[PDB]
Design a protein around this nucleic acid. Structure first.
Ligand SMILES: C[C@@H]1C[C@@H]([C@H](O)CC2CC(=O)NC(=O)C2)C(=O)[C@@H](C)C1
Ligand SMILES: [K+]
Ligand SMILES: [K+]
Ligand SMILES: [K+]
Ligand SMILES: [Mg+2]
Ligand SMILES: [Mg+2]
Ligand SMILES: [Mg+2]
Ligand SMILES: [Mg+2]
Ligand SMILES: [Mg+2]
Ligand SMILES: [Mg+2]
Ligand SMILES: [Mg+2]
Ligand SMILES: [Mg+2]
Ligand SMILES: [Mg+2]
Ligand SMILES: [Mg+2]
Ligand SMILES: [Mg+2]
Ligand SMILES: [Mg+2]
Ligand SMILES: [Mg+2]
Ligand SMILES: [Mg+2]
Ligand SMILES: [Mg+2]
Ligand SMILES: [Mg+2]
Ligand SMILES: [Mg+2]
Ligand SMILES: [Mg+2]
Ligand SMILES: [Mg+2]
Ligand SMILES: [Mg+2]
Ligand SMILES: [Mg+2]
Ligand SMILES: [Mg+2]
Ligand SMILES: [Mg+2]
Ligand SMILES: [Mg+2]
Ligand SMILES: [Mg+2]
Ligand SMILES: [Mg+2]
Ligand SMILES: [Mg+2]
Ligand SMILES: [Mg+2]
Ligand SMILES: [Mg+2]
Ligand SMILES: [Mg+2]
Ligand SMILES: [Mg+2]
Ligand SMILES: [Mg+2]
Ligand SMILES: [Zn+2]
Lengths: 105, 217, 159, 52, 58
RNA sequence: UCGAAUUUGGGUAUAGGGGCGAAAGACUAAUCGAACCAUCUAGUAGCUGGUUCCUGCCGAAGUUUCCCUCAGGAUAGCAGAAGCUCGUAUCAGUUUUAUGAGGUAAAGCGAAUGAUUAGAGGUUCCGGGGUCACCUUGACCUAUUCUCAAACUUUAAAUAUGUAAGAAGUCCUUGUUACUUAAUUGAACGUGGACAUUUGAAUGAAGAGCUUUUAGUGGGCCAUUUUUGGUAAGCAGAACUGGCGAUGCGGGAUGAACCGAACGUAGAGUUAAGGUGCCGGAAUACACGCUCAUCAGACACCACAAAAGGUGUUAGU
RNA sequence: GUGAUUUCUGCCCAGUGCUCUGAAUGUCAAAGUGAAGAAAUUCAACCAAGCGCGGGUAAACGGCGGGAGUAACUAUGACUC
RNA sequence: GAAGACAUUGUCAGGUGGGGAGUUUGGCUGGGGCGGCACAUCUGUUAAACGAUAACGCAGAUGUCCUAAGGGGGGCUCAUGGAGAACAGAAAUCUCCAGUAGAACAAAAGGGUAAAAGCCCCCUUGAUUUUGAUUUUCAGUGUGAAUACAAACCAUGAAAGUGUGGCCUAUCGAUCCUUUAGUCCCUCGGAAUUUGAGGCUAGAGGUGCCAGAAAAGUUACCACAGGGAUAACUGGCUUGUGGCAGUCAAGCGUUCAUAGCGACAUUGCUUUUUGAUUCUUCGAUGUCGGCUCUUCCUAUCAUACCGAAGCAGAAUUCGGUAA
RNA sequence: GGUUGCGGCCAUAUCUACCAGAAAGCACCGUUUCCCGUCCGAUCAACUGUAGUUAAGCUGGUAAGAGCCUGACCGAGUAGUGUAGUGGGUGACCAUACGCGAAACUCAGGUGCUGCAAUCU
RNA sequence: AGCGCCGUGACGCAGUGGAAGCGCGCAGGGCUCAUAACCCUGAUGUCCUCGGAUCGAAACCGAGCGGCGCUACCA
RNA sequence: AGCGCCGUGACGCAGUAGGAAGCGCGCAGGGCUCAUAACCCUGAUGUCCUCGGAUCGAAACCGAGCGGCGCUACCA
RNA sequence: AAAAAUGAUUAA
């Protein structure tokens, strides 16, 4: 799929509260960042004797992911998250379609 | 090596024609449906004799072929080929299925039983009911006994009950003989390939003169 | 596996009628529905918005809500051992007035008219409908109508 | 059932073997091949050009 | 060992044992699903007509 | 086999996931693919078996959805109990009237889409093997003709199915509003007034509504009809209804389900289904015919019969 | 491991295993080192063995192919692909 | 005498470690296993004209694709045929006529659509924010999908109007944990500041056994609880397959359908084969054959008496009564 | 009654061939400076209503016309079907009783009706 | 019975939805007295059939044909 | 015993989904050679195993026979 | 010290 890098959409930033211009990027997760409480609990539980203490997932079925769009207002820098359907190929702001063109083979 | 006809005698299933969902059907055994002087005109063979079914069943194409051969061969041997026209009036459109099993000692190691029992096409049958014409013969009045006994011989090739009916219609037309005579004495009948065309009060007038010209005189 | 989607088994009842395809005539859109009107549900297959589910084809209900292009229809649906109130949001394409309720309203006006006349003259106007009564006596004259008919007929081949 | 599998690495050319029950799942890569036109080859490192 | 898959046998007899009952309509049904603009109006119309009735009766 | 890798006493050593094994998973005190004794320990069991007095009243389920769910649970239903608010109704496994909805049965194919038999007449700048604008395998068109469809259809039943048949109604004024209209227009809700005892079809109503809480069940099976797979099946799988299970009684000799009819303890009468030669209660009744079998026949479910044939005999065309 | 004597014990080290090097590099723990921070801490470099890369080894585990043409009767195929 | 701050020993860290330990090794299923997916779904049919409806029924499809293939508006009309135009021909572009869709609309199938939902062009982001109500599956739970409003902000158009993704019917995912966005808010409990951590609202990372454990085999050395809910022997139903009989009569039999045969067809019977089924038996009915011994059946090989023959005789062949 | 503007039902309105059309209306029609749009003033834009024509559109008629619409004790109470019997038949199936009931077929008619507003030999 | 695979130039075989390639074989010329070797040059394919989807299939789908195989266990 | 197959010159092989047969060896005759062999050309050689059927027409389709090939043939 | 195989039968 192909989504533009720029998009006009509603911004609920308490100063816009209206359709403003947004910059579009893809959401990236970020580092798991140990010292999170779940990570501390997990390290404490895995210490000592007893083997593996938690489930280890194996039965992978999905091959794609949902794409999340990170929308940034250009007036107040407020951000918003939009979700798209599953896709295999995702690209941002590239190569708008040409309608009446010969096949390149 | 084909199953006896009692396995497929009755119309237990819905019709199962060759279609885009079936498309893997063997060819029917019967290919010829008109025999004798099939190009003969209507007025040449005023007499019609029918082999009317008396049971609601289905007739295999093998039986249709066998009775076709028997009736045609007898009538051709006795009164020649040009003395009659035989039209068989049922087509094997229903497909029979067989769930084929192994038939040897040791079949139990691989037999699979009644699982996935949907059968594959096995043969073709024509579905007929009470009073449905199977065979029709048109000939002259003087050739009545030959075609009657030929249809009697064809009867033994079919399962169940069948009657022999002398028609009161002129040949293969839907008209009685006296009314067909009344129509040729007028200008209401024009010859065609083997059948005829009729003149009506309806339609374009000038068309009804270019056809049937000798009427309106 | 089995398939039980929203529009399954609707092949023939979401057809348009033969030689009746195309656009909808404006009398569909000029009909006025009030709350309390009794309407019949029949989906127009050419309008895929506000379309009722296949269950409600042929059901008759009461309008409870009126919106811009749609009405809210209340239908009683038998689920198990009781009827559940079901509320539908249907565009007016799939909706027509119940003609039976139109004759009921006309009959109410006619009943009022009969009672109004009877209050002045001709008391005991006897409003209620009655079922088809047995016929009374009559004298069937034969003069010019002499009875004449034969017996059953013999069997003939006709083949 | 179990499946014994013998396969050659598509890059290193080495034989790999593995075995698994016939009804468990294994991964299959998303192997794709692409046409390119051969420009210069200087320090190895073939320089290639796409359909564009 | 396969068992029976499905049947609606005896289900109507069970349903009719305690009868199939209509949902007992009331006067003044709930305004759930009615248009909010209509509901907002109707609150003020009811308030005004009760005010007029109480003012007249005293 | 019998002079040695011999046989054997006594002593001694090796102890249980340990020993010992010229190897058999052998042996380790009648115990060995992990001894024996005691304890944890009344170990756990969705599995088998059992589960102790009487009478009275009511009275099932084998189905829905979810579950490493398929011999089990939860959930809803079916059942009981406690009742509560009222006192003939906001009702109904029914009909009528009115009004919808449907695409099956049937039908149709010289109507669409597919399938399909045979000729006829025209179209070769549409290729016909043929000689200078032709009968002579084709393909196309036109008018015909034979036969078809679970996944074709113009048409289109029967049965089943929705709704309405008023007081929470109808009509007349004029009130509310921030909704609506160009508007003092509507929308919805109202004040006041009018409508009489047929308050707006029929029949019935055994009291009508309402609530809490909890049992068992969650293997089903049979019959008529519809119906799928299968050569078929006392086969496997669905639909509606009635049954059996849970149920005796009369009849079908016998039999879960068929027919009749459902059950407190008795008496009398009358019947059902089925019968009335004798077993066996009840006409070896009456009447008109048919049948003679050196393998007659003799009551539905049901305990089978076919294609085919006969100057047997009877009736008939 | 094989199993008296006799006579033999062919070919295959790609896989699995076993074994032997290098420092030319990849992976790379704890401790130690450096840097940013107020500090917890974060980042980076260095980084043993093993792994990885590369040799050896079958009386280690084991393994030990298809198709086609071709001779002056055919048939077969010494030969050839 | 050797050896020496090295070894050793202690603690932590990486590797190796079936030698040993613990555990697991899905379900449905005409028994199980192998196969398949009928395990979450969608179209048509089965399905019996409301709705619902099963099978390892039938014919298929889904785990995607799309900044346009979404939204609005404008203009035009498609498949196909006929007649024509240099190269150009059956298929290149151009023109006219006919053309109810016989085209196209991402992708199965069904439905829908002609001044359009198709094709081309001009703008655009409504594929947005806040929640509630509703429909389908349904317990009237969730999830997925969808319908109609409300309050905003917008797009498009002259405007009515339309637009909360794809013309409709499929295209997907809880708890815990991690992560991001939002409010710049609440808490770290002796009082503050700053890091850090924890909360509230809303997305993502995934459970396809799709209401969502983290999971390899073998056992003929085997064990237990059970099951005739379920296979393997007998019996029962069926009789495809096996075996036997009939009807017809093309043809064979020098001449001649039927002395004897008898194709193509077709009607049966039997239970001595093999299957199908799963009703009886799993707190056990001893499971092949042979040997021994009795009896029964007849569909008769021989023997008795017969009829027929392409029966001179002989020898045969067909048939009746007959076990 | 004709015509026009907007329509309602959406073929009794459609289709094929031919004929006719006072008056008005509609239409064809003439032109490109302007607004606007094209490969092309052909469509669309604008101007004139003048220069011309009913040739075409449009409206009506004609046709043993095609289609479509309505009806018939035409087929036919046929096909189908609900209920019932210890009905018939070996069975497939069939009849009867109490009910409902087609579609093809044949024949006969018909071929737009109409609302608001303006105008007219 | 159920399931899987293969079919390409004369032969053995590759093959990326944009009309097919390696090795021999074959053909032409040369060298040799001649053949082979050798040298210089060319050519050879409804991709098993018949339909379908796609603008376009050798590849995808449906059938039909011909070969190769696998399962065949507890009784 | 069943279920599939196949049979084409003197010898082998090709048909194909019906409109009468091709190729290669062998034979004979020619061309080359002193004469041969090899080579080349040409010709002959198949009543498609027999019989029967359906068809306008069968080596191709159907049945029988004959011969050969391949697969299958209690049971615990 | 590069490579270099073959040549049908009979006929003083
Ligand atoms: C596969 C990974 C983890 C998974 C999930 O946290 C796994 C389990 C872990 C656990 O122990 N208890 C749970 O309740 C969930 C999840 O959410 C996915 C999106 C991402
Ligand atoms: K089941
Ligand atoms: K249907
Ligand atoms: K184990
Ligand atoms: Mg610790
Ligand atoms: Mg540790
Ligand atoms: Mg069936
Ligand atoms: Mg939509
Ligand atoms: Mg001795
Ligand atoms: Mg052992
Ligand atoms: Mg012992
Ligand atoms: Mg009691
Ligand atoms: Mg009781
Ligand atoms: Mg039990
Ligand atoms: Mg149970
Ligand atoms: Mg019970
Ligand atoms: Mg009895
Ligand atoms: Mg009864
Ligand atoms: Mg007595
Ligand atoms: Mg040794
Ligand atoms: Mg060796
Ligand atoms: Mg470190
Ligand atoms: Mg081995
Ligand atoms: Mg272990
Ligand atoms: Mg299982
Ligand atoms: Mg599930
Ligand atoms: Mg239905
Ligand atoms: Mg968190
Ligand atoms: Mg049982
Ligand atoms: Mg048999
Ligand atoms: Mg059992
Ligand atoms: Mg027992
Ligand atoms: Mg047991
Ligand atoms: Mg015994
Ligand atoms: Mg006998
Ligand atoms: Mg020599
Ligand atoms: Zn902003």
């Amino acid at each position: 799929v192909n989504v533009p890098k720029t998009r006009k959409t509603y911004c609920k930033g308490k100063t816009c509260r209206k359709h403003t211009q947004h910059k579009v990027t893809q959401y990236k997760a970020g580092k798991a960042s140990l010292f999170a409480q779940g990570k501390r609990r997990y390290d404490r539980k895995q210490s000592g004797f007893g083997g593996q203490t938690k489930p280890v997932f194996h039965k992978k079925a999905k091959t794609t992911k949902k794409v999340v769009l990170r929308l940034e207002c250009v007036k107040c820098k407020t951000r918003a998250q939009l979700t798209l359907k599953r896709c295999k190929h995702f690209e941002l702001g590239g190569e708008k379609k040409q309608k009446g063109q010969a096949l390149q083979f | 090596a084909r199953r006896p006809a009692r396995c497929y005698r009755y119309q237990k299933n819905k019709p199962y024609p060759k279609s885009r969902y079936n498309r893997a059907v063997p060819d029917s055994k019967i290919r010829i449906y008109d025999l004798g002087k099939k190009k003969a005109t209507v007025d040449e063979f005023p007499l019609c004799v029918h082999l009317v079914s008396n049971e609601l069943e289905q007739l295999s194409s093998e039986a249709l072929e066998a009775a076709r051969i028997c009736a045609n061969k007898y009538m051709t041997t006795v009164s020649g080929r040009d003395a009659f026209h035989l039209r068989v009036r049922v087509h094997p459109f229903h497909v029979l299925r067989i769930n084929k099993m192994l038939s040897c000692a040791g079949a139990d190691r691989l037999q699979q039983g009644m699982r996935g029992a949907w059968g594959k096409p096995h043969g073709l049958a024509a579905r007929v009911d009470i009073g449905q014409i199977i065979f029709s013969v048109r000939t002259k009045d003087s050739n009545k006994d030959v075609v009657v006994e030929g249809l009697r011989r064809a009867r033994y090739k079919f399962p169940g009950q069948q009657k022999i009916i002398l028609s009161k219609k002129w040949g293969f037309t839907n008209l009685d003989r006296p009314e067909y005579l009344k129509k040729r004495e007028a200008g209401e009948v024009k010859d065609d390939g083997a059948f005829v065309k009729f003149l009506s009060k309806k339609g374009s007038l000038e068309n009804n003169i270019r056809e049937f010209p000798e009427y309106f005189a | 596996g089995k398939s039980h989607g929203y529009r399954s088994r609707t092949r023939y009842m979401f057809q348009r009628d033969f030689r009746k395809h195309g656009a909808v005539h404006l009398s569909t859109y000029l009909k006025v529905y009030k709350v309390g009107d009794i309407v019949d549900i029949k989906a127009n297959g050419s309008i895929q918005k506000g379309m009722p589910h296949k269950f409600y084809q042929g059901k008759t209900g009461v309008v409870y809500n009126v919106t811009k292009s749609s009405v809210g229809v209340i239908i009683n649906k038998m689920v198990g051992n009781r009827y559940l109130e079901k509320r539908l949001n249907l565009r007016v394409e799939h909706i027509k007035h119940s003609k039976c309720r139109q004759e009921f309203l006309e009959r109410v006006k006619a009943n009022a008219a009969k009672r109004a006349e009877a209050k002045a003259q001709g008391v005991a106007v006897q409003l209620k409908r009655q079922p088809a009564q047995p016929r009374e006596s009559r004298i069937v004259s034969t003069e010019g109508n002499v009875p004449q008919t034969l017996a059953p007929v013999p069997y003939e081949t006709f083949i | 059932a179990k499946v014994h599998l013998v396969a050659i690495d598509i890059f290193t050319g080495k034989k790999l073997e593995d075995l698994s029950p016939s009804t468990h799942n294994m991964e299959v890569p998303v192997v794709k091949r692409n046409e390119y036109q051969l420009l210069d080859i200087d320090d190895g490192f073939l320089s290639l050009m796409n359909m564009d | 060992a396969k068992s029976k898959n499905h049947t609606a046998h005896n289900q109507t007899r069970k349903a009719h044992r305690n009868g199939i009952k209509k949902p007992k309509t009331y006067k003044y049904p709930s305004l759930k699903g009615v248009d909010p603009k209509f509901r907002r109006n109707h609150k003020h119309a009811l308030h005004g007509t009760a005010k007029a009735l109480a003012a007249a009766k005293k």
